[PDB]
Design a protein around this ligand. Structure first.
Ligand SMILES: Nc1ncnc2c1ncn2[C@@H]1O[C@H](COP(=O)(O)OP(=O)(O)NP(=O)(O)O)[C@@H](O)[C@H]1O
Ligand SMILES: Nc1ncnc2c1ncn2[C@@H]1O[C@H](COP(=O)(O)OP(=O)(O)NP(=O)(O)O)[C@@H](O)[C@H]1O
Ligand SMILES: Nc1ncnc2c1ncn2[C@@H]1O[C@H](COP(=O)(O)OP(=O)(O)NP(=O)(O)O)[C@@H](O)[C@H]1O
Ligand SMILES: [Mg+2]
Ligand SMILES: [Mg+2]
Ligand SMILES: [Mg+2]
Lengths: 483, 53, 469, 484
């Protein structure tokens, strides 16, 4: 037995195997145990190596042989993973056979530096009225989806993926956006069901699923987002665009905490290791928009965080907020009232997306940012005087609040969006009741499609509002409202 | 008339207050709970550091 | 003929190296491992005995092998110092990262240096006009002082610095050094595009600011040290060039955080909240070098991250005493759409003193402060029971405080996208007078909204008439 | 021959584990061959753990460590006045050698039970609020406590500055030599403080001991004890010294760093188990010596920093239990325009009135209890009350009494200036005066009494007491001024 290429197990417990030999091993090299279970050389010491396991401890005994692999932790990458569901190490879990890899990338890849980047200016269209109008996301950005349990976090990301069906059926490769969805810590059934939804809406052919679910070993959960970013990165490095959802990072952090405490690293705040920030920061730095010279690709990140009791000041929330380029905060209070998406506009922001917004939306979003989250000034005070001036903003406010509502699985085209907002901002809804704003919107879009389709087409094709189209839009709006 | 106006205004102002109070009670029951958890953890870390040496 | 050892142990950022000879590299020396791509640098941290040293790597240690050859450079990490650093972008190890060729500097200085002695200290009480209302009024910045911006995540630290660079950088005469520690690589891109576009860095021409980066993608070793690199350059300007130097750092907390990431791996027993036992002295050794001395002057702005919005966390708290001026940003405040989100009752200055700013300035600042304070002591009662249950005195003070509150807000030029409004700037003398008048009850008839996001008092008058039409 | 020398076994973090040094004493000074000095704190079977008094960058494995044969000591003596030294008494003002009467060890047994006498001589701080409500005696430990940037140093600083009234004389019994201990402050902050003492000509009777923020934890830990010794000389030779520890919070942090790196198992909040002892032995050394011992004293003003108003925190709770009372400074009072921001309710001086010039004691009757009765009422006024004649008046009186306790920094006052003010206040010769004008009253009035009724002020300074004759003169004199 070569002790250079090979090892003998000294001990195993707490997700670590202590191994003797493997003298030629590299730090962070993947290893193989007798049972076929894999590991990662984490700490090389005089006279032994400490290996973190990617499975149950049952699958490793004392005295067993361990084989070197040659390879730092890596994964298959390339357009051949499209339509596929894999585990954190890249192994298919969808019943469909060997993955078709263009090649292999490390799990841990260094972020694009200061030079190879350019500011985001290309829209990521979500098809969500509230997000596209008020927290516009640009290709290369990082935008946190954050909020309590059961507040629509996943819905927001999933509508975004379903929405890409719009361009991923065209030919123009630059407008396309491939999707990597990472499930970390979720239930197997949630993810199975999610994939079936994707299949049913025909979204699956442009998306990749990477799953490390609830009963799997902490390191597989720790690892999944990293192997998913290299999968995402392939598109970035080859002049194409990929969206990556990390659902969710809260659970990644928890798994990382499990590993650190069993590794006997000192518990800090909320028991997380000191490096739990570096955990996320290195991951998320890999999202970017690249320069002309680097082929202009982009990886856009939508990490998901789960607050407890709505507290965005906890350690992990604030860590991620101090990394991403903004947050979409979802309030449980709005969610229970029926306001869904429950986007708390006061607390939501996109730091770089404004540039990348579609002009049409930008133009009918005049101050909507300021006004709405400020109607919130009056609204909170309202329930001391039956005022004159501030009775108007209470009626407009209430309207735009309904306009922003949106059914699930129903992402809407920009040119379907801008009229609804124009019709809100200019007060053509002021007269219509609350209970009918829902029906108004479906009936109004029908009207526009059948009768004023020339104009929608112009919004879609130029993305701007010429004074003439602006005036023509005023025309068609007034007509419908009157009846 | 001034009395019945006053008495109606009391029951009305107090309704808004008890409502507004409960809201703070809700916001502080949450902070309480955070702090309580933090207290148990932080105490445990001292026991832990102490045990390791 | 060099000094070589082999790698004995690898745990994360920490690499242990054995040497075959009696002679062993000094603590703080830079070592080298030749790899497939480039060179990995390690910094000696401690001597473990039995001829083995412990080091902290400056880059990832993926791929290292026990037995791998280690080279001693016989010196610490060194950086290009001098004018040749201006308009360049540099590493923790002093290599360029803007692909513009070698920094052809005449000298290279070690990043670890001893702080200037008590004898070398040079104190002054000289105001630094910022054109930002709250700062200029309630807690003045000091030329050659140490200014620090405290904020939770997203509350406005970086926008603030960019406004200060926007105000002070072009008209300073001297040279700036910006150091990014543990921040967004993209933010570096946003700034290198900025200093180019404004001309403060000119590709072909001449440049006033050197940039040094060690962002949040970087392993801990690099995050720890990158501030000492950006400082060593700042010190060469201060000393030999007798330059009045501006030093910006975003963000100084990241330095200490990087220290805790490795502390465990170094064998230390954790102090409070999991931080390194040496948190304070590590910070003293860094802070104390960032000072204005007898040979030259250093005005320094530091972004200071506040973990979990907890200003009692050892890191930010230990930072306070090092600063001559502190602006504390509040989430609660910023959530009222008040930007800058400066807490006017928690930001402080050495220079808030009548013998510096004049009694009129002092008296206004203090009455403003008393006014705001009254509102604070009342908030609970205002929120539970409303305005009705205040005495008239109080009702008026509360009415007034809220007008001051909003008047302290100001449209920055660099937040034009989020304000929708052009960036205004207010001369100190105007801030003093404008506030003086509000207190004097001269603007009570004006609705609250006219003070929100404007410049001086002329601007209120304007916006009040704009609303009344 | 490993009895006087040793070899460095391992080194880092300002800590060295040494082989040999077989005869070394616990707490002994050592010299490393590379220059740096150290202190043996751990003596174990096969080795010695040593804390470095400087950088360890130059220490190497195998390096030779030498016994000094000395327990850590310092130069002490009158020669040290006007100077600034480090923890080991090395001069750091570039003014050359110190000349010392001798050397005392850092750690010194405190006065036992027999050799003491009750505090009875005032430390006149010059501050109305303190001197009236929390008077400090010669030999008392009075804690100064509060959050960052609340006035803590400004309380101690105005005491040192005030000692000028007596330090300029030859009368040695009345003089109060000052010692200020900067621990973990930044050097610039200290330069700024010795710049101010200079401008007030107070440096000539002060000694600065600075273990500032960039210095090795063993230097910060040691600074208070070696600074007690410097101060003890005055005490041990019929003189008097005030000692300011600025601040002990930062010293406790340094001791913690020391102990964890020595791998001594920590206690609460990672502090060493004996962190209470650390502070108690320091402050027990402040003391008022008995006549058979020359009658000298050491008064200590230790400074503690609380976080978020948290006085129940570990270290602040420790020190509170050691001292003879505290001055609680509060940010909320600071911003209402109360300076010094002293919380009167929470602040005591335990030695109490036994350490207060009699005249002040008389005129400040139940000022402290009254001010409590005032806030008892300023509490009932909140829910929109309407008070009877007694309550509305005392509410007016206290509101003005509070106003009279405001005071500028670097503007300390003599008892004979203090007394008339407190006198006018408590009696009600200020009630029928508009509130916003008590400040200009204070200076107009003290000038008035200096020109018209000057013989009175002269009397109080000399005789430190009042009789019916002094009372009625002043009562007649104040009543005069009220009509401008
Ligand atoms: N826009 C919407 N309109 C109406 N219902 C919605 C909308 N979005 C989500 N829902 C429903 O609300 C529930 C919560 O949404 P989901 O996207 O699962 O949030 P989540 O924050 O990911 N919850 P979890 O991850 O399980 O804690 C789901 O049952 C959705 O079907
Ligand atoms: N002066 C300002 N005016 C208006 N909005 C602002 C201002 N400053 C900050 N904001 C808002 O808050 C965001 C915070 O940006 P930034 O200045 O990077 O804060 P920060 O505290 O450094 N964030 P981080 O470092 O990630 O914790 C901005 O993108 C704006 O949306
Ligand atoms: N009586 C006073 N009136 C007005 N201002 C004062 C007064 N006393 C002190 N100040 C100022 O208030 C600030 C804080 O005072 P300082 O004495 O440094 O307190 P501290 O709590 O020791 N601060 P730090 O050491 O920074 O935690 C200083 O700038 C003083 O100049
Ligand atoms: Mg979900
Ligand atoms: Mg920032
Ligand atoms: Mg102080």
């Amino acid at each position: 037995a070569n002790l250079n290429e090979t090892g003998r197990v000294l001990a195993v417990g707490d997700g670590i195997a202590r191994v003797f030999g493997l003298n030629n091993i590299q730090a962070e090299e993947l290893v193989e145990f007798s049972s076929g279970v894999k590991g990662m050389a984490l700490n090389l010491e005089p006279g032994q190596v400490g290996i973190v396991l990617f499975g149950s401890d049952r699958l490793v005994k004392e005295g067993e042989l361990v084989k070197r692999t040659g390879n730092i932790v890596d994964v298959p990458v390339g357009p051949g993973l499209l339509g596929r569901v894999v585990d954190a190490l890249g192994n298919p879990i969808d019943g469909k056979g060997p993955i078709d890899a263009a090649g292999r990338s490390r799990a841990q890849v260094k972020a694009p530096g200061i030079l190879p980047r350019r500011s985001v200016h290309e829209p990521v269209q979500t098809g969500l009225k509230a997000v596209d109008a008020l927290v516009p996301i640009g290709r290369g950005q990082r935008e946190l989806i954050i909020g309590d349990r059961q507040t629509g976090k996943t819905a927001v990301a999933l509508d975004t993926i379903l929405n890409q069906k719009r361009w991923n059926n065209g030919s123009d490769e630059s407008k396309k956006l491939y999707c990597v969805y990472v499930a970390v810590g979720q239930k197997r059934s949630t993810v199975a069901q999610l994939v079936q939804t994707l299949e049913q809406h025909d979204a699956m052919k442009y998306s990749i699923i990477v799953a490390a679910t609830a009963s799997e070993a902490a390191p597989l959960q720790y690892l999944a987002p990293f192997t998913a970013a290299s999968i995402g990165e392939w598109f970035r490095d080859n002049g194409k665009h990929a969206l990556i959802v990390y659902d969710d990072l809260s659970k990644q952090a928890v798994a990382y905490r499990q590993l650190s405490l069993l590794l006997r690293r000192p518990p800090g705040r909320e028991a997380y290791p000191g490096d739990v920030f570096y955990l996320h920061s290195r991951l998320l730095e890999r999202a970017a928009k690249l320069s002309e010279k680097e082929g202009s690709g982009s990886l856009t990140a939508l990490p998901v965080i789960e607050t407890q009791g709505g507290d965005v000041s906890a350690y992990i929330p604030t860590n991620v907020i101090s990394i991403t380029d903004g947050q979409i905060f979802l309030e449980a209070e709005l969610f229970y009232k029926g306001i869904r998406p429950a986007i708390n506009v006061g607390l939501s922001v996109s730091r770089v997306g404004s540039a990348a917004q579609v002009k049409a939306l930008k133009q009918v979003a005049g101050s909507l940012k300021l006004f709405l989250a400020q109607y919130r000034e009056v609204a909170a005070s309202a329930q001391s005087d039956l005022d004159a001036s501030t009775k108007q903003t209470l009626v407009r406010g209430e309207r735009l609040t309904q306009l922003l509502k949106q059914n699930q699985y129903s992402p809407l085209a920009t040119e379907e969006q801008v009229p609804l907002i124009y019709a809100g901002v200019n007060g053509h809804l002021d007269g219509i009741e609350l209970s009918r704003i829902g029906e108004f919107e479906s009936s109004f879009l029908s009207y526009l499609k059948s009768n004023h389709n020339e104009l929608l087409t112009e919004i879609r094709e130029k993305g701007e509002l010429s004074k003439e189209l602006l005036a023509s839009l005023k025309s068609a709006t007034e007509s419908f409202v009157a009846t | 008339q001034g009395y019945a106006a006053e008495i109606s205004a009391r029951r009305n102002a107090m309704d808004n207050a008890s409502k507004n109070a409960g809201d703070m009670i809700n916001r502080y029951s949450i902070l309480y709970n955070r702090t309580r958890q933090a207290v148990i953890t932080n105490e445990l870390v001292d026991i832990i550091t102490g045990a390791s040496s | 003929t060099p000094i070589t050892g082999k790698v004995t142990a690898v745990i994360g950022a920490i690499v242990d190296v054995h040497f075959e000879q009696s002679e062993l590299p000094a603590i703080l020396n830079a070592l080298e491992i030749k790899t497939p791509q480039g060179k990995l640098v390690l910094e000696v941290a401690q001597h473990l005995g039995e001829n083995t040293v412990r080091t902290i790597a400056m880059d990832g240690t993926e791929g290292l092998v026990r037995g791998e050859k280690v080279l001693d450079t016989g010196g610490p990490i060194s950086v290009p110092v001098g004018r040749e650093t201006l308009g360049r972008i540099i590493n923790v190890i002093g290599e360029p990262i803007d692909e513009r060729g070698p920094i052809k500097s005449k000298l290279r200085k070690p990043i670890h240096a001893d702080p200037p002695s008590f004898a070398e200290q040079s104190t002054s009480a000289e105001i630094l006009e910022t054109g930002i209302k709250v700062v200029d009024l309630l807690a003045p910045y000091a030329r050659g002082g140490k200014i620090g911006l405290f904020g939770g995540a997203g509350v406005g630290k970086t926008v603030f610095i960019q406004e200060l660079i926007n105000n002070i950088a072009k008209a300073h005469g001297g040279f700036s050094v910006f150091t990014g520690v543990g921040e967004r690589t993209r933010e570096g891109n946003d700034l290198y595009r900025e200093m180019k576009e404004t001309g403060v860095i000119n590709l072909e021409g001449e440049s006033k600011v050197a940039l040094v980066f060690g962002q949040m993608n970087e392993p801990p070793g690099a995050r720890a040290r990158v501030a000492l690199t950006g400082l060593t350059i700042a010190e060469y300007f201060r000393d030999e060039e007798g330059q009045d130097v501006l030093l910006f750092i975003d963000n100084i907390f990241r330095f200490t955080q990087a220290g805790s990431e490795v502390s465990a791996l170094l064998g230390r027993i954790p102090s409070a909240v999991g931080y390194q036992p040496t948190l304070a002295t590590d910070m003293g050794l860094l802070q104390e070098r960032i000072t204005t001395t007898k040979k030259g002057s250093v005005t320094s702005v530091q972004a200071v991250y506040v973990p979990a919005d907890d200003l009692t966390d050892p890191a930010p708290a230990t930072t306070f005493a090092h600063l001559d001026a502190t602006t504390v940003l509040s989430r609660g405040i910023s959530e009222l759409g008040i930007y800058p989100a400066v807490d006017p009752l928690d930001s402080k200055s050495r220079l808030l003193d009548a013998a510096v700013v004049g009694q009129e300035h002092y008296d206004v600042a203090s009455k403003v402060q008393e006014t705001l304070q009254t509102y604070k002591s009342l908030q609970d009662i205002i929120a539970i029971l409303g305005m009705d249950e205040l005495s008239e005195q109080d009702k008026l003070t509360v009415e007034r405080a809220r007008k001051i509150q909003r008047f302290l807000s100001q449209p920055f030029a660099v937040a034009e996208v989020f304000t929708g409004i052009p960036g205004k700037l207010v001369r100190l003398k105007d801030t003093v007078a404008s506030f003086k008048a509000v207190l004097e009850g001269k603007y009570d008839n004006i609705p609250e909204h006219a003070f929100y996001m404007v410049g001086g008092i002329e601007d209120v008058v304007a916006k009040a008439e704009k609303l009344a039409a």
